[model samples]
Target: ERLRLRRDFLLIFKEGKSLQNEYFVVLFRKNGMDYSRLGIVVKRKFGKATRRNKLKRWVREIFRRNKGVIPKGFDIVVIPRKKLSEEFERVDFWTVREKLLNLLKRIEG
Candidate 1:
Protein backbone atom coordinates (compact mmCIF):
# COMPACT_ATOMS: atom_id res chain seq x y z
CA GLU A 1 0.00 0.00 0.00
CA ARG A 2 1.28 3.42 0.95
CA LEU A 3 4.46 4.40 2.79
CA ARG A 4 2.12 6.51 4.90
CA LEU A 5 3.89 8.78 7.34
CA ARG A 6 6.06 11.89 7.60
CA ARG A 7 8.72 9.98 9.49
CA ASP A 8 8.70 7.15 7.00
CA PHE A 9 9.12 9.54 4.10
CA LEU A 10 11.98 11.28 5.80
CA LEU A 11 13.71 8.07 6.77
CA ILE A 12 13.57 6.80 3.24
CA PHE A 13 14.70 10.13 1.84
CA LYS A 14 17.68 10.03 4.12
CA GLU A 15 18.76 6.60 2.93
CA GLY A 16 17.14 6.05 -0.44
CA LYS A 17 18.70 5.66 -3.83
CA SER A 18 17.15 7.80 -6.55
CA LEU A 19 16.40 6.79 -10.11
CA GLN A 20 14.91 9.19 -12.61
CA ASN A 21 13.97 9.59 -16.22
CA GLU A 22 12.34 12.37 -18.22
CA TYR A 23 9.03 12.46 -16.36
CA PHE A 24 9.66 11.13 -12.91
CA VAL A 25 12.19 10.36 -10.21
CA VAL A 26 11.92 7.25 -8.06
CA LEU A 27 13.37 6.94 -4.60
CA PHE A 28 13.88 3.54 -3.11
CA ARG A 29 14.99 2.21 0.26
CA LYS A 30 15.10 -1.28 1.59
CA ASN A 31 12.38 -2.15 4.12
CA GLY A 32 11.61 -4.85 6.66
CA MET A 33 8.10 -5.50 5.42
CA ASP A 34 6.94 -8.46 3.39
CA TYR A 35 5.49 -6.14 0.74
CA SER A 36 6.72 -3.01 -0.92
CA ARG A 37 5.16 0.33 -0.01
CA LEU A 38 4.47 3.17 -2.42
CA GLY A 39 4.48 6.90 -2.12
CA ILE A 40 3.68 9.43 -4.83
CA VAL A 41 4.81 13.02 -4.48
CA VAL A 42 3.26 15.42 -6.95
CA LYS A 43 5.00 18.75 -7.05
CA ARG A 44 3.23 21.40 -5.03
CA LYS A 45 3.47 23.95 -7.82
CA PHE A 46 2.18 21.58 -10.49
CA GLY A 47 -1.51 22.33 -9.97
CA LYS A 48 -4.18 22.92 -7.39
CA ALA A 49 -4.48 20.64 -4.38
CA THR A 50 -7.43 18.82 -5.94
CA ARG A 51 -5.54 17.99 -9.10
CA ARG A 52 -2.47 16.95 -7.13
CA ASN A 53 -4.59 14.48 -5.21
CA LYS A 54 -6.04 13.32 -8.50
CA LEU A 55 -2.55 12.76 -9.84
CA LYS A 56 -1.63 10.58 -6.86
CA ARG A 57 -4.87 8.66 -7.31
CA TRP A 58 -3.97 8.06 -10.94
CA VAL A 59 -0.45 6.95 -10.06
CA ARG A 60 -1.64 4.75 -7.23
CA GLU A 61 -4.03 2.92 -9.51
CA ILE A 62 -1.23 2.48 -11.97
CA PHE A 63 0.92 0.96 -9.25
CA ARG A 64 -1.89 -1.23 -7.94
CA ARG A 65 -2.17 -2.96 -11.30
CA ASN A 66 1.54 -3.73 -11.52
CA LYS A 67 2.42 -3.98 -7.86
CA GLY A 68 3.49 -7.59 -7.87
CA VAL A 69 6.09 -7.12 -10.59
CA ILE A 70 8.27 -5.35 -8.08
CA PRO A 71 10.01 -7.23 -5.32
CA LYS A 72 8.98 -7.09 -1.69
CA GLY A 73 10.96 -5.45 1.13
CA PHE A 74 11.29 -1.98 -0.32
CA ASP A 75 9.72 1.44 0.04
CA ILE A 76 9.23 3.18 -3.28
CA VAL A 77 8.48 6.82 -3.78
CA VAL A 78 7.66 8.37 -7.14
CA ILE A 79 8.01 12.04 -7.92
CA PRO A 80 6.53 13.59 -11.02
CA ARG A 81 8.85 16.06 -12.67
CA LYS A 82 8.35 19.46 -14.22
CA LYS A 83 8.23 17.90 -17.67
CA LEU A 84 5.29 15.71 -16.69
CA SER A 85 3.48 18.60 -15.11
CA GLU A 86 3.87 20.66 -18.24
CA GLU A 87 2.07 18.05 -20.29
CA PHE A 88 -0.31 16.70 -17.67
CA GLU A 89 -3.49 18.31 -18.93
CA ARG A 90 -3.50 16.14 -22.05
CA VAL A 91 -1.35 13.17 -21.07
CA ASP A 92 -2.34 9.62 -21.96
CA PHE A 93 -2.63 7.07 -19.20
CA TRP A 94 -1.37 4.13 -21.25
CA THR A 95 1.86 5.86 -22.16
CA VAL A 96 2.51 6.80 -18.57
CA ARG A 97 1.76 3.26 -17.48
CA GLU A 98 4.24 1.89 -19.97
CA LYS A 99 6.87 4.31 -18.85
CA LEU A 100 6.31 3.43 -15.23
CA LEU A 101 6.38 -0.26 -16.03
CA ASN A 102 9.66 0.09 -17.84
CA LEU A 103 11.08 2.07 -14.96
CA LEU A 104 9.99 -0.46 -12.37
CA LYS A 105 11.49 -3.30 -14.37
CA ARG A 106 14.79 -1.58 -13.93
CA ILE A 107 14.41 -2.44 -10.29
CA GLU A 108 13.72 -6.07 -11.10
CA GLY A 109 16.64 -6.54 -13.46
Candidate 2:
Protein backbone atom coordinates (compact mmCIF):
# COMPACT_ATOMS: atom_id res chain seq x y z
CA GLU A 1 0.00 0.00 0.00
CA ARG A 2 1.28 3.45 -0.87
CA LEU A 3 0.72 6.39 1.45
CA ARG A 4 2.58 8.95 -0.55
CA LEU A 5 0.65 12.07 -1.53
CA ARG A 6 3.48 13.15 -3.81
CA ARG A 7 2.45 14.01 -7.35
CA ASP A 8 4.23 14.73 -10.56
CA PHE A 9 2.99 18.35 -10.84
CA LEU A 10 2.96 18.47 -14.60
CA LEU A 11 0.69 15.47 -14.99
CA ILE A 12 -2.40 17.27 -13.79
CA PHE A 13 -1.63 20.51 -15.59
CA LYS A 14 -0.31 18.96 -18.75
CA GLU A 15 -0.91 15.25 -19.29
CA GLY A 16 -3.87 14.68 -17.00
CA LYS A 17 -7.17 15.29 -18.72
CA SER A 18 -10.25 16.87 -17.21
CA LEU A 19 -13.66 15.42 -16.56
CA GLN A 20 -16.37 17.97 -15.85
CA ASN A 21 -19.05 16.95 -13.45
CA GLU A 22 -22.09 18.36 -11.72
CA TYR A 23 -20.26 18.98 -8.44
CA PHE A 24 -16.58 19.04 -9.34
CA VAL A 25 -14.04 18.86 -12.14
CA VAL A 26 -11.82 15.78 -12.15
CA LEU A 27 -8.33 15.66 -13.66
CA PHE A 28 -6.24 12.49 -13.88
CA ARG A 29 -3.29 10.75 -15.55
CA LYS A 30 -2.32 7.13 -15.35
CA ASN A 31 1.46 6.82 -15.20
CA GLY A 32 3.28 3.56 -14.61
CA MET A 33 3.67 3.10 -10.87
CA ASP A 34 2.53 1.00 -7.90
CA TYR A 35 0.10 3.57 -6.50
CA SER A 36 -1.57 6.87 -7.20
CA ARG A 37 -0.38 10.35 -6.31
CA LEU A 38 -2.86 13.18 -5.97
CA GLY A 39 -3.14 16.91 -5.99
CA ILE A 40 -6.33 18.83 -5.31
CA VAL A 41 -7.08 22.35 -6.51
CA VAL A 42 -9.52 24.17 -4.31
CA LYS A 43 -9.39 27.76 -5.38
CA ARG A 44 -9.19 30.27 -2.57
CA LYS A 45 -11.88 32.29 -4.27
CA PHE A 46 -14.38 29.67 -3.24
CA GLY A 47 -14.91 30.95 0.34
CA LYS A 48 -13.56 32.11 3.67
CA ALA A 49 -10.73 30.19 5.36
CA THR A 50 -13.04 27.99 7.38
CA ARG A 51 -15.16 27.10 4.43
CA ARG A 52 -12.16 26.49 2.24
CA ASN A 53 -10.64 24.12 4.77
CA LYS A 54 -13.95 22.34 5.09
CA LEU A 55 -14.06 21.83 1.36
CA LYS A 56 -10.48 20.57 1.28
CA ARG A 57 -11.22 18.16 4.10
CA TRP A 58 -14.22 16.88 2.24
CA VAL A 59 -12.18 16.33 -0.90
CA ARG A 60 -9.31 14.62 0.89
CA GLU A 61 -11.63 12.40 2.89
CA ILE A 62 -13.35 11.33 -0.26
CA PHE A 63 -10.02 10.43 -1.82
CA ARG A 64 -8.72 8.58 1.22
CA ARG A 65 -11.72 6.32 1.35
CA ASN A 66 -11.93 5.52 -2.33
CA LYS A 67 -8.39 5.66 -3.75
CA GLY A 68 -7.55 2.03 -3.10
CA VAL A 69 -9.69 0.60 -5.87
CA ILE A 70 -7.95 2.84 -8.38
CA PRO A 71 -5.41 1.18 -10.68
CA LYS A 72 -1.87 1.82 -9.51
CA GLY A 73 0.68 4.13 -11.15
CA PHE A 74 -1.49 7.12 -11.84
CA ASP A 75 -1.51 10.81 -11.03
CA ILE A 76 -4.90 12.19 -10.06
CA VAL A 77 -6.02 15.71 -9.49
CA VAL A 78 -9.37 17.06 -8.43
CA ILE A 79 -10.50 20.63 -8.95
CA PRO A 80 -13.50 22.11 -7.25
CA ARG A 81 -15.21 25.06 -8.80
CA LYS A 82 -16.23 28.09 -6.76
CA LYS A 83 -19.78 26.77 -6.72
CA LEU A 84 -18.71 23.83 -4.58
CA SER A 85 -18.57 26.02 -1.50
CA GLU A 86 -22.23 26.80 -1.73
CA GLU A 87 -23.20 23.14 -1.75
CA PHE A 88 -20.52 21.88 0.59
CA GLU A 89 -22.92 21.13 3.38
CA ARG A 90 -25.33 19.32 1.12
CA VAL A 91 -22.86 16.94 -0.51
CA ASP A 92 -21.74 13.76 1.17
CA PHE A 93 -18.01 12.98 1.03
CA TRP A 94 -18.59 9.26 0.60
CA THR A 95 -20.92 9.94 -2.29
CA VAL A 96 -18.20 11.95 -3.95
CA ARG A 97 -15.80 9.12 -3.15
CA GLU A 98 -18.00 6.66 -4.98
CA LYS A 99 -18.34 8.87 -8.00
CA LEU A 100 -14.63 9.56 -8.19
CA LEU A 101 -13.65 5.94 -7.73
CA ASN A 102 -15.99 4.78 -10.46
CA LEU A 103 -14.64 7.39 -12.79
CA LEU A 104 -11.01 6.41 -12.14
CA LYS A 105 -11.82 2.74 -12.52
CA ARG A 106 -13.35 3.39 -15.89
CA ILE A 107 -10.32 5.37 -16.97
CA GLU A 108 -8.13 2.31 -16.49
CA GLY A 109 -10.02 0.44 -19.18
Candidate 3:
Protein backbone atom coordinates (compact mmCIF):
# COMPACT_ATOMS: atom_id res chain seq x y z
CA GLU A 1 0.00 0.00 0.00
CA ARG A 2 1.00 3.65 -0.44
CA LEU A 3 2.62 5.42 2.48
CA ARG A 4 2.46 9.10 1.64
CA LEU A 5 1.09 12.62 2.15
CA ARG A 6 2.84 15.52 3.89
CA ARG A 7 1.36 14.66 7.23
CA ASP A 8 2.37 11.03 6.93
CA PHE A 9 5.95 11.74 5.98
CA LEU A 10 6.47 14.35 8.63
CA LEU A 11 4.95 12.26 11.36
CA ILE A 12 7.08 9.27 10.49
CA PHE A 13 10.28 11.33 10.34
CA LYS A 14 9.52 13.04 13.57
CA GLU A 15 8.62 9.91 15.50
CA GLY A 16 10.36 7.02 13.77
CA LYS A 17 13.57 5.11 14.19
CA SER A 18 15.85 4.55 11.20
CA LEU A 19 18.34 2.15 9.67
CA GLN A 20 21.01 3.33 7.26
CA ASN A 21 24.12 2.66 5.28
CA GLU A 22 26.11 4.62 2.70
CA TYR A 23 23.55 3.86 0.03
CA PHE A 24 20.23 4.44 1.80
CA VAL A 25 18.20 5.33 4.82
CA VAL A 26 15.15 3.34 5.85
CA LEU A 27 12.96 5.32 8.20
CA PHE A 28 10.11 3.58 9.95
CA ARG A 29 7.72 3.50 12.87
CA LYS A 30 4.51 1.86 14.01
CA ASN A 31 1.19 2.46 12.28
CA GLY A 32 -0.82 0.32 14.72
CA MET A 33 -2.62 -1.45 11.93
CA ASP A 34 -2.75 -5.03 10.75
CA TYR A 35 -0.19 -4.58 8.01
CA SER A 36 2.64 -2.36 6.83
CA ARG A 37 2.86 0.24 4.07
CA LEU A 38 5.69 1.73 2.07
CA GLY A 39 7.16 4.92 0.67
CA ILE A 40 10.17 5.41 -1.58
CA VAL A 41 11.80 8.81 -1.78
CA VAL A 42 14.59 9.37 -4.27
CA LYS A 43 15.37 13.05 -4.27
CA ARG A 44 16.35 15.22 -7.23
CA LYS A 45 19.77 15.42 -5.69
CA PHE A 46 19.92 11.63 -5.99
CA GLY A 47 19.71 11.83 -9.76
CA LYS A 48 17.79 12.88 -12.83
CA ALA A 49 14.19 11.78 -13.32
CA THR A 50 14.80 8.39 -14.85
CA ARG A 51 17.37 7.39 -12.28
CA ARG A 52 15.20 8.50 -9.40
CA ASN A 53 12.21 6.72 -10.86
CA LYS A 54 14.18 3.58 -11.52
CA LEU A 55 15.45 3.34 -7.97
CA LYS A 56 12.00 3.81 -6.55
CA ARG A 57 10.63 1.06 -8.75
CA TRP A 58 13.31 -1.36 -7.68
CA VAL A 59 12.84 -0.50 -4.04
CA ARG A 60 9.12 -1.07 -4.37
CA GLU A 61 9.71 -4.45 -5.86
CA ILE A 62 12.07 -5.34 -3.06
CA PHE A 63 9.53 -4.42 -0.44
CA ARG A 64 6.66 -6.04 -2.27
CA ARG A 65 8.42 -9.33 -2.61
CA ASN A 66 9.91 -9.37 0.86
CA LYS A 67 7.07 -8.01 2.93
CA GLY A 68 6.95 -11.05 5.15
CA VAL A 69 10.41 -10.40 6.48
CA ILE A 70 9.22 -7.37 8.38
CA PRO A 71 6.57 -7.54 11.08
CA LYS A 72 3.20 -5.85 11.12
CA GLY A 73 1.96 -2.29 11.71
CA PHE A 74 4.71 -0.19 10.21
CA ASP A 75 4.96 2.81 7.90
CA ILE A 76 8.30 2.33 6.19
CA VAL A 77 10.06 4.90 4.04
CA VAL A 78 13.15 4.52 1.91
CA ILE A 79 15.57 7.30 1.04
CA PRO A 80 18.47 6.34 -1.16
CA ARG A 81 21.75 8.23 -1.45
CA LYS A 82 23.08 10.34 -4.33
CA LYS A 83 26.13 8.09 -4.47
CA LEU A 84 23.87 5.42 -5.90
CA SER A 85 23.95 7.21 -9.24
CA GLU A 86 27.65 6.59 -9.53
CA GLU A 87 27.18 2.88 -9.07
CA PHE A 88 23.71 2.62 -10.55
CA GLU A 89 24.41 0.25 -13.36
CA ARG A 90 27.16 -1.62 -11.62
CA VAL A 91 24.66 -3.94 -9.96
CA ASP A 92 21.32 -5.47 -10.61
CA PHE A 93 18.32 -6.36 -8.48
CA TRP A 94 20.15 -9.15 -6.71
CA THR A 95 22.71 -6.69 -5.47
CA VAL A 96 20.13 -4.19 -4.30
CA ARG A 97 17.84 -6.77 -2.80
CA GLU A 98 20.53 -8.05 -0.51
CA LYS A 99 21.57 -4.60 0.67
CA LEU A 100 18.10 -3.25 1.31
CA LEU A 101 16.93 -6.47 2.83
CA ASN A 102 19.94 -6.60 5.05
CA LEU A 103 19.14 -3.20 6.52
CA LEU A 104 15.49 -4.04 6.76
CA LYS A 105 16.26 -7.27 8.56
CA ARG A 106 18.24 -5.36 11.12
CA ILE A 107 15.04 -3.65 12.12
CA GLU A 108 13.37 -6.99 12.49
CA GLY A 109 16.13 -8.27 14.72
Better of 2 and 3 by lDDT: 3
Kindly list the per-residue Cα lDDT of model 2 for residues 1-109, writing each as its tens digit: 2323344555456776767656677676766777776667777778788977877777677666766676667777777765556676787767666656666676553
Best by TM-score: 3
TM-score for model 1? 0.88
Question: What lDDT score belongs to each candidate, Candidate 1 first?
Answer: 0.79, 0.66, 0.81
Give the range where candidate 2 is weakest over 10 consecutive residues by summed lDDT.
1-10
Model 2 segments beyond 4 Å from truth? Answer: 1-11
Tens-digit per-residue lDDT, 1-109, candidate 3? 6677467988888888999876778888888788889888776777687877888899989988898976678888888876666788886889888888888777642
TM-scores of the candidates in the order shown = 0.88, 0.74, 0.88
- Residues 1-109, model 1: lDDT tens digits: 6578577778778887777788888888888788888888776798898879877888888888887777677888888898889888788888778777677657532
Instruction: Return the candidate ranking by lDDT, descending.
Output: 3, 1, 2
Better of 1 and 3 by TM-score: 3
> What is the lDDT for 38 in model 3?
89
Position 37, candidate 2: lDDT:
68
Q: Of the candidates shown, which would achieve the greatest lDDT relative to the real structure?
A: 3
